[PDB]
Amino acid sequence: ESIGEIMGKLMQGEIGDEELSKRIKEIFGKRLQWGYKPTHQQQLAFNLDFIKSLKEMYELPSAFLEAAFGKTIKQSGCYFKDETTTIDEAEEASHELYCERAQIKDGQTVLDIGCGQGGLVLHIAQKYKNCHVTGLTNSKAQKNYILMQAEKLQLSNVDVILADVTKHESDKTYDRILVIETIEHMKNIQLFMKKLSTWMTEDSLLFVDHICHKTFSHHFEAIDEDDWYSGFIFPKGCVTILSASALLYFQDDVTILDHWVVNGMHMARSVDAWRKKLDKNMELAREILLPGLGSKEAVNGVITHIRTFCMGGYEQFSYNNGEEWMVAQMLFKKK
Ligand X SMILES: C[S@@+](CC[C@H](N)C(=O)[O-])C[C@H]1O[C@@H](n2cnc3c(N)ncnc32)[C@H](O)[C@@H]1O
Ligand Y SMILES: COc1ccc(C[C@@H]2c3cc(O)c(OC)cc3CCN2C)cc1O
76 annotated ligand binder? yes
Indicate which of a copy of itself, ligand Y, ligand X, none lies near residue 148 (CB less than 5 to 8 Å, by partner kind).
none
* 169-208: contacts with ligand Y (CB under 6 A): 181, 184
* 64-103: contacts with ligand Y (CB under 6 A): 75-76
Dump the DSSP string for 157-210.
SEEEEES-TTT-------SEEEEES-GGG-S-HHHHHHHHHHT--TT-EEEEEE
The residues, any chain, with a CB within 8 Å of residue 155's CB and separated by 6 or more, are 122, 125, 126
Q: Interface mask (CB under 6 A) for ligand Y, residues 263-302, using x and -?
A: ----------------------------------------
Q: Interface mask (CB under 6 A) for ligand Y, residues 239-258, using x and -?
A: x-------------------
75 annotated ligand binder? yes
Judge whether 213 and 325 are in contact, CB under 8 Å.
yes
Judge whether 166 and 179 are in contact, CB under 8 Å.
no
Q: Catalytic: 78?
A: no
Told to check if 313 binds ligand Y by CB under 6 A, we report yes
CB of 253 to a copy of itself, least distance (A): 9
Indicate which of ligand X, a copy of itself, ligand Y, none lies near residue 156 (CB less than 5 to 8 Å, by partner kind).
none
| Three-state secondary structure call for residue 243 | strand
Residue 329, number of CB atoms within 10 A of its CB: 21
From 72-80, 176-184, 246-254, 268-276, give the range in contact with a copy of itself by CB under 8 A: 246-254
* 304-323: contacts with a copy of itself (CB under 8 A): 322-323
Told to check if 248 binds a copy of itself by CB under 8 A, we report yes
Specify the residue, 214 or 333, whose C-beta has the smaller distance to ligand Y: 214
Told to check if 80 binds a copy of itself by CB under 8 A, we report no
- Reported for 79-87, long-range contacts at CB under 8 A and 24+ positions apart, including other chains, are 79/262, 79/266, 80/265, 80/266, 80/269, 80/270, 85/269, 86/273, 87/270, 87/273, 87/274, 87/277
- Which residues of this chain interact with ligand X, rule CB under 6 A? 74-76, 114-116, 119, 137-139, 164-166, 180-182, 185
Among 1, 40, 156, 171, binds a copy of itself (CB under 8 A): 40
Bridge-based pairing of strands 132-137 and 109-113 is parallel
Positive/negative CA dihedral, 294, 231, 318, 75: negative
The whole-angstrom separation of Cα 228 and Cα 12 is: 15
Indicate which of ligand Y, a copy of itself, ligand X, none lies near residue 326 (CB less than 5 to 8 Å, by partner kind).
a copy of itself
User: Angle at Cα 83 formed by Cα 207 and Cα 265, nearest 5°?
Assistant: 45
The whole-angstrom separation of Cα 252 and Cα 85 is: 40
Specify the residue, 76 or 245, whose C-beta has the smaller distance to ligand Y: 76
The residues, any chain, with a CB within 8 Å of residue 212's CB and separated by 6 or more, are 241, 242, 243, 244, 246, 261, 325, 326, 327, 328
Told to check if 203 binds a copy of itself by CB under 8 A, we report no
Told to check if 244 binds a copy of itself by CB under 8 A, we report yes
| Three-state secondary structure call for residue 276 | helix
Applying CB under 8 A, the site for a copy of itself has a residue count of: 25
Task: Give the burial class of 235: count Cβ atoms within 10 A of its Cβ; 0-12 exposed, 13-18 middle, 19 or more buried.
Answer: exposed
Indicate which of ligand X, a copy of itself, ligand Y, none lies near residue 138 (CB less than 5 to 8 Å, by partner kind).
ligand X
Told to check if 227 binds ligand Y by CB under 6 A, we report no
> Nearest 5°: phi and psi at 179?
-135, 100
Q: Which residues are catalytic?
A: 310
**Where do contacts with a copy of itself occur on this chain (CB under 8 A)?**
39-41, 44-45, 48, 214, 244-245, 248-249, 251-252, 255-256, 258-263, 322-323, 326, 335
> What residues are designated binding site?
75-76, 138, 142, 164-165
> What residues are designated binding site for S-adenosyl-L-methionine?
75-76, 164-165
